[PDB]
Amino acid sequence: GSLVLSCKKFPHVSVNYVVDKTPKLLTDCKEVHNCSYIINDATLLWNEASRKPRLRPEVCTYIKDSKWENKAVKDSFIGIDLTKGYDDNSLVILKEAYQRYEKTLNPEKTTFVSLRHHIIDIIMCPFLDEPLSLLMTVQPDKNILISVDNKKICYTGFALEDLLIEHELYYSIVHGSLNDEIDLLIQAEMDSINTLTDTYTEIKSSVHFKLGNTYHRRKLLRMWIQTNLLPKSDLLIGFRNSYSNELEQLKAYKIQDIYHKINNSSIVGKPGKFYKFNPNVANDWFQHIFQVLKQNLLLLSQESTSTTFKVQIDTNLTLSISPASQFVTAL
Ligand SMILES: [Mn+2]
């Protein structure tokens, strides 16, 4: 019926393992659909009908040249108080995306279907001091659906996207292979596209990184997982004055960049406690739980009345899989 399993002794490389070119989490990863969600209209505008959020041209210009067109331009961004004006369902889209691409799912593999948020959450377990909980339903088609069950730092983030981009949300549905027996159909919200480079660009707000500070090592590792799960994607980070909240610097990064930042022969000098936040360890952990999960959820299902399961993971990486009520749906 249920199941407990220790996953702390999962195969993985050395915490100190360094390698030059960042690894990849999914192979043959490609976007298979995309869509803008017009909220007031309760509409989904698929693919060629979707309105991609465009990164302002000045910014694209700045990213390319590595300098602003002129002082005026620069002052339209740098120095702006990302605080000014602070005093003021996703599972539905996924299910439509699954319905539109299903006939294209490889029938020889198990496909986990989920919003990017959850895949990231799972890869992070061993790097967090908090635990994990989620629902995983084994659909009649034998695939698996994953679902669920600081106002100011948050606002500066929307404020920054607003300042850099030209009510409505844009989703990218990608497909990638994990195993010889496992694929992922992931839904992810793109912040924007860099028009000059035809590359999604993930906007992040932050205070200058105090590396060697666990909080930032986490953020940087999560950032890496977040973009490295997509087929194409870059980052743009707005660094702000920890005091004024003024946007001090705009810095663009490729996945390689974020990777290097957290995988040096030098950085791995200080001893760690979370596998030193090593992207490769993360990658190994990735390969391990999903194999574990796919196997057991499949096994338990054949012997149960419930297609849905409560999946939990200890701070000790101990997996717990008990069946959920067959008379309840998580929307
Ligand atoms: Mn963002």
UniProtKB/Swiss-Prot annotation:
Binding of a divalent metal cation, residues: E161, D191, E202, I203
UniProt catalytic activity: a 5'-end NAD(+)-phospho-ribonucleoside in mRNA + H2O = a 5'-end phospho-ribonucleoside in mRNA + NAD(+) + H(+); a 5'-end (N(7)-methyl 5'-triphosphoguanosine)-ribonucleoside-ribonucleotide in mRNA + H2O = a (N(7)-methyl 5'-triphosphoguanosine)-nucleoside + a 5'-end phospho-ribonucleoside in mRNA + H(+)
Compartments, as annotated in UniProt: Cytoplasm
Outcome of swapping L115W: Reduced decapping activity without affecting the exonuclease activity. Reduced decapping and exonuclease activities
Taxonomy, superkingdom: Eukaryota
Predominant place of localization: cytoplasm
Keyword Electron transport: no
Binding-site residues, substrate: E189, K204, Q226
Keyword Hydrolase belongs to the record: yes
Pfam families per the UniProt record, alphabetical: RAI1
GO BP annotations listed: NAD-cap decapping; nuclear mRNA surveillance; nucleic acid metabolic process
UniProt KW keywords: Cytoplasm, Exonuclease, Hydrolase, Metal-binding, Nuclease, Nucleotide-binding, RNA-binding
Cofactor(s) required for function per UniProt: a divalent metal cation
Molecular functions (GO terms): 5'-3' exonuclease activity; metal ion binding; mRNA 5'-diphosphatase activity; nucleotide binding; RNA binding; RNA NAD+-cap (NAD+-forming) hydrolase activity
The EC number(s) this enzyme carries: 3.6.1.-, 3.1.13.-
Cofactor binding comment, as recorded: Divalent metal cation.
Family: Belongs to the DXO/Dom3Z family.
Record-given protein name: Decapping and exoribonuclease protein 1
Organism of origin: Kluyveromyces lactis (strain ATCC 8585 / CBS 2359 / DSM 70799 / NBRC 1267 / NRRL Y-1140 / WM37) (Yeast)
Name of the gene this protein is made from: DXO1
